[PDB]
Amino acid sequence: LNEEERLIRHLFQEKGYNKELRPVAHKEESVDVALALTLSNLISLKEVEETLTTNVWIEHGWTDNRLKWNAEEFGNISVLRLPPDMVWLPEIVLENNNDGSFQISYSCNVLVYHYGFVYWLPPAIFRSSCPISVTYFPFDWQNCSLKFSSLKYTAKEITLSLKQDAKENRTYPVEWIIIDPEGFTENGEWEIVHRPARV
Amino acid sequence: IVCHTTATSPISAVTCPPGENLCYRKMWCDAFCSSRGKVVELGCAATCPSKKPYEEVTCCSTDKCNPHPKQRP
Amino acid sequence: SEHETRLVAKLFKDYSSVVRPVEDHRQVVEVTVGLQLIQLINVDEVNQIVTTNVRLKQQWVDYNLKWNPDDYGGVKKIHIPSEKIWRPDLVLYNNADGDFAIVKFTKVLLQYTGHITWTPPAIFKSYCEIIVTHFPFDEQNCSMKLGTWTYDGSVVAINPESDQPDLSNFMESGEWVIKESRGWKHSVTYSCCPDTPYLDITYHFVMQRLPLYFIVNVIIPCLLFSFLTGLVFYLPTDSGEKMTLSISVLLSLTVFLLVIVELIPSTSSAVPLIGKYMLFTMVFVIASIIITVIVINTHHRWKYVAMVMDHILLGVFMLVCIIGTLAVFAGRLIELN
Amino acid sequence: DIVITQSPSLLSASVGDRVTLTCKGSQNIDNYLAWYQQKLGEAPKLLIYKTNSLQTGIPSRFSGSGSGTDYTLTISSLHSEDLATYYCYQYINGYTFGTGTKLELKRADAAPTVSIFPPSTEQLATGGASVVCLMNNFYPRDISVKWKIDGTERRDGVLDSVTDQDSKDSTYSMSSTLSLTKADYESHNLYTCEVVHKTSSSPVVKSFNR
Amino acid sequence: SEAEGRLREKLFSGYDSSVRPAREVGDRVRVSVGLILAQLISLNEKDEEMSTKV
Ligand SMILES: *[C@@H]1O[C@H](CO)[C@@H](O[C@@H]2O[C@H](CO)[C@@H](O[C@@H]3O[C@H](CO[C@H]4O[C@H](CO[C@H]5O[C@H](CO)[C@@H](O)[C@H](O)[C@@H]5O)[C@@H](O)[C@H](O[C@H]5O[C@H](CO)[C@@H](O)[C@H](O)[C@@H]5O[C@H]5O[C@H](CO)[C@@H](O)[C@H](O)[C@@H]5O)[C@@H]4O)[C@@H](O)[C@H](O[C@H]4O[C@H](CO)[C@@H](O)[C@H](O)[C@@H]4O)[C@@H]3O)[C@H](O)[C@H]2NC(C)=O)[C@H](O)[C@H]1NC(C)=O
Numbered sequence: 001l002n003e004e005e006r007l008i009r010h011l012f013q014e015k016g017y018n019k020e021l022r023p024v025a026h027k028e029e030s031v032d033v034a035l036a037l038t039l040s041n042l043i044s045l046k047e048v049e050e051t052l053t054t055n056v057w058i059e060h061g062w063t064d065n066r067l068k069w070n071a072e073e074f075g076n077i078s079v080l081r082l083p084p085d086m087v088w089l090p091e092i093v094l095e096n097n098n099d100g101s102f103q104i105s106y107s108c109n110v111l112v113y114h115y116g117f118v119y120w121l122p123p124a125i126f127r128s129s130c131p132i133s134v135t136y137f138p139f140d141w142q143n144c145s146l147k148f149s150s151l152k153y154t155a156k157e158i159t160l161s162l163k164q165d166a167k168e169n170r171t172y173p174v175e176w177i178i179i180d181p182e183g184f185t186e187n188g189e190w191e192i193v194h195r196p197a198r199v
Numbered sequence: 200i201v202c203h204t205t206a207t208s209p210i211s212a213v214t215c216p217p218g219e220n221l222c223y224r225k226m227w228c229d230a231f232c233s234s235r236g237k238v239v240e241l242g243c244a245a246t247c248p249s250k251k252p253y254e255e256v257t258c259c260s261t262d263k264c265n266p267h268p269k270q271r272p
Numbered sequence: 273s274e275h276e277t278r279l280v281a282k283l284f285k286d287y288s289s290v291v292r293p294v295e296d297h298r299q300v301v302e303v304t305v306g307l308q309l310i311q312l313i314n315v316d317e318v319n320q321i322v323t324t325n326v327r328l329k330q331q332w333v334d335y336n337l338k339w340n341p342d343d344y345g346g347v348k349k350i351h352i353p354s355e356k357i358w359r360p361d362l363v364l365y366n367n368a369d370g371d372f373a374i375v376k377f378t379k380v381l382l383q384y385t386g387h388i389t390w391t392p393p394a395i396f397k398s399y400c401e402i403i404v405t406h407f408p409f410d411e412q413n414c415s416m417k418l419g420t421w422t423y424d425g426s427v428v429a430i431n432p433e434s435d436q437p438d439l440s441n442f443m444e445s446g447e448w449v450i451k452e453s454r455g456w457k458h459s460v461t462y463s464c465c466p467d468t469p470y471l472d473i474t475y476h477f478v479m480q481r482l483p484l485y486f487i488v489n490v491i492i493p494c495l496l497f498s499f500l501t502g503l504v505f506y507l508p509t510d511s512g513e514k515m516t517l518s519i520s521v522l523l524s525l526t527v528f529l530l531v532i533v534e535l536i537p538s539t540s541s542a543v544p545l546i547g548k549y550m551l552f553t554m555v556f557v558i559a560s561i562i563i564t565v566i567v568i569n570t571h572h573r574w575k576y577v578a579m580v581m582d583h584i585l586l587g588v589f590m591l592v593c594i595i596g597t598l599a600v601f602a603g604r605l606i607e608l609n
Numbered sequence: 610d611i612v613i614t615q616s617p618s619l620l621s622a623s624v625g626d627r628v629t630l631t632c633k634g635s636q637n638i639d640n641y642l643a644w645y646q647q648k649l650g651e652a653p654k655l656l657i658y659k660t661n662s663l664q665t666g667i668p669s670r671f672s673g674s675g676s677g678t679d680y681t682l683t684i685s686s687l688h689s690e691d692l693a694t695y696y697c698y699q700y701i702n703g704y705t706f707g708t709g710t711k712l713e714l715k716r717a718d719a720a721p722t723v724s725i726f727p728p729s730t731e732q733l734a735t736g737g738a739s740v741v742c743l744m745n746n747f748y749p750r751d752i753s754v755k756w757k758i759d760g761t762e763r764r765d766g767v768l769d770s771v772t773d774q775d776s777k778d779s780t781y782s783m784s785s786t787l788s789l790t791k792a793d794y795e796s797h798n799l800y801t802c803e804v805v806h807k808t809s810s811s812p813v814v815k816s817f818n819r
Numbered sequence: 820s821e822a823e824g825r826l827r828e829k830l831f832s833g834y835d836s837s838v839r840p841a842r843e844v845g846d847r848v849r850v851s852v853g854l855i856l857a858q859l860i861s862l863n864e865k866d867e868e869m870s871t872k873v
């Protein structure tokens with residue numbers, strides 16, 4: 001019998017996993033959700049419609065202790081791939097969207113690691129509201145933004161934070177938009193000067 | 200000389216072609232560098248490969264002197 | 273008359289579409305991927321997006337979906353809704369603004385060997401680095417990078433069905449000719465993981481533009497305006513038509529600029545060759561107007577000097593027109609030739 | 610459908626020996642092979658399915674292995690209870706069975722006790738004239754029998770049967786018959802039965818006249 | 820969340836989201852309506868149409 005089948009029966013049916021309930025020991029705890037954003041392409045900026053269209057990959061990470069297992073008890077399965085409809089999600093949305101598309105476009109699998117970390121990298125096409133400043137046009141620069149928050153959970157139930165990377169065993173927060181230094185095709189009309197992130 | 204190469208899957212140790220004498224390892228970030236770490240390319244070269252601005256290259260003349268970052272010589 | 277219902281019930285009673293369809297979890301699912309290109313719907317140089325109609329044939333063996341045909345009256349194949357079964361999550365990595373994955377969940381054809389063929393239709397809007405320098409005689413190498421989004425090469429392996437995309441059903445395009453096509457499988461290594469490769473199949477198509485439309489609608493008007501701007505120097509000063517002629521040509525070029533800016537892509541990545549020719553024509557008209565003013569003022573001061581200047585400048589202007597036209601078009605024509 | 614062959618057709622083995630039986634298909638059987646044991650007068654019992662999986666309650670002596678078109682069943686240490694016919698079959702494309710392997714107990718060689726009997730006059734009064742030739746307690750079962758009448762060999766009307774291994778001595782007993790009419794019998798006078806068996810370089814002969 | 824799960828399971832036992840919560844037959848459900856304007860997206864005088872995010 002496939003060890004994945006046994007492990008999934010264990011996690012979801014045997015332990016009775018409820019995706020409706022937050023992964024907390026006590027209701028007063030908030031789940032830390034870490035976000036990073038990878039900009040795949042800057043599709044367009046339309047000044048007449050004041051709309052920024054971007055292709056992005058939103059790297060979610062959080063801990064769900066209900067999804068822990070010992071790999072040696074399940075044939076050294078260290079990572080598991082699940083439909084996002086099965087697990088509890090923090091339900092993050094693009095707040096400043098321009099067209100009513102609040103949620104992510106493609107519901108890809110979540111990766112659940114044996115130590116309980118849930119990693120998700122949904123790709124999405126977003127059309128955000130970017131108010132244009134026309135003063136110096138054409139030599140203008142625009143300060144667009146993407147604002148992510150949860151409407152289903154408040155700041156008491158889940159905590160937003162930036163992803164931390166590490167070098168020389170010293171951690172630091174990733175305070176900027178991730179861009180591929182070689183695969184990123186630049187937009188035909190716009191150059192990215194700065195790309196900070198703030199909580 | 201014998202060097203590591205990524206031309207095979209998995210990484211394998213291969214005797215270089217005649218004339219080529221330097222093992223090399225090249226690395227750079229890609230769209231997945233945030234979670235997968237740097238790309239790693241291992242191989243044999245007669246001359247140390249040119250560096251694109253984002254690339255990191257290390258060249259050496261010892262057998263198996265260019266291990267994967269998780270391995271050791 | 274009831275055995276196919278029995279077969280489907282027996283197959284899916286305990287099926288799970290979450291686990292990979294292998295006997296042992298350490299095995300790799302081997303998926304064969306074949307891109308069929310039905311139609312090149314659109315190319316957008318301004319947003320650098322290529323829109324294509326495709327059939328994404330995927331073939332793999334589901335270990336749990338075997339049956340014995342003699343148990344079911346010799347039924348050797350059935351049709352199943354693809355939402356029921358496990359599927360590889362192929363994603364278009366270089367999606368511009370379309371769907372990342374398949375969204376038309378057609379039926380799969382399932383054979384008694386467990387072999388599944390799934391041929392979903394898709395519309396792909398891939399991101400392509402359009403090169404506009406040689407426009408309109410340009411060739412574009414545009415690509416479609418496909419791969420499993422969440423499975424890595426140690427759990428799902430994808431293999432190209434053939435060296436080339438299937439163009440047998442390709443509807444011929446009215447503006448681009450596919451010069452060649454080719455799929456290459458790539459395996460990449462990362463510093464996290466010495467053991468697990470990441471696999472993708474990049475299909476690519478070299479499309480050549482048919483330039484005739486842009487030759488007709490753009491090149492000829494500019495050539496005519498250049499010719500008139502040259503001819504204005506043979507016109508006598510005493511006619512009085514000189515200034516009217518040059519002003520009318522400038523106005524006509526400015527009006528046609530409203531067409532040019534619609535036809536030429538607004539990409540600031542590089543100046544299009546046709547855009548360079550347009551700017552050359554504009555500068556030539558401007559210089560012709562300035563020189564006409566200078567000559568008119570000279571003649572009213574010297575008449576023979578002005579006439580000799582007119583005769584020299586006529587040849588100069590016509591030679592500059594022909595030289596510019598050749599330097600613009602001949603290089604790209606020779607490259608294509 | 611997949612054709613299956615088994616080897617060896619008979620396998621003489623001794624108690625406690627390891628023994629291996631081979632099954633080979635015409636096509637890939639994809640490990641959908643099963644082995645079952647049958648004794649005389651007994652319900653068949655499944656031993657192995659899916660090439661490896663022991664049937665519940667089967668002794669650990671049996672183990673299966675194989676791939677592609679070639680598969681084997683192994684008994685690590687032959688018990689006396691394991692002497693039987695073993696069938697492989699496949700269940701992936703149709704259902705097809707091998708001819709069976711008759712695993713049988715090893716036995717010391719024995720020469721056949723050959724004898725011949727004419728049709729008695731009580732039979733001749735009825736018009737039947739079946740001659741009979743017997744070969745008792747021979748081993749191995751490899752044996753050949755020939756009927757000769759007035760020196761000429763005969764094949765028409767010849768029949769034969771062989772017992773199974775004796776429950777006490779594991780030898781075999783064989784009978785052979787030659788049915789004839791009274792006229793055909795009286796047309797000849799010399800009769801002989803010739804027996805070829807591995808225990809002798811020359812055949813044994815038993816004969817009668819008048 | 821044991822207590823939240825148990826309370827949530829309690830409340831929806833026999834609940835029917837299609838039936839309005841009037842206790843007596845003549846009772847009316849009072850609904851307060853408020854509006855927060857997040858963005859006046861546009862006004863179009865050709866379609867006589869105002870687009871808002873609220
Ligand atoms: C339009 O644009 C597109 C962009 O999409 C252009 O596409 C590019 O087209 C090129 C050819 O025109 C392709 O190059 C060729 O790629 C082949 C595939 O390479 C990958 O697989 C290799 C292993 O595959 C073998 O085994 C499988 C198994 O069956 C077979 O099916 C295959 O055919 C092969 O036999 C693997 O080795 C490669 O990885 C190596 O290279 C990459 C960089 O390319 C490194 O990152 C890897 O680490 C690795 O490097 C190792 O190997 C090299 C030597 O190759 C060493 O120097 C390194 O140190 C290290 O050890 C890939 O994963 C290649 O097989 C093929 O090789 C030919 O050429 C090389 C020299 O260039 C010779 O050494 C070989 O002998 C052979 O002749 C070649 O590279 C591009 O892949 C393709 N790119 C993309 C992104 O699609 C297209 O051409 C454009 N068209 C126009 C403009 O008209």
Ligand SMILES: *[C@@H]1O[C@H](CO)[C@@H](O)[C@H](O)[C@H]1NC(C)=O
Pocket residue numbers: 071072073074075076
């Ligand atoms: C898991 O990994 C360990 C260490 O490599 C190995 O000994 C063991 O056999 C593997 N299998 C299981 C089922 O634990």
Ligand SMILES: [Cu+2]
Pocket residue numbers: 273274275276277
């Ligand atoms: Cu039927």
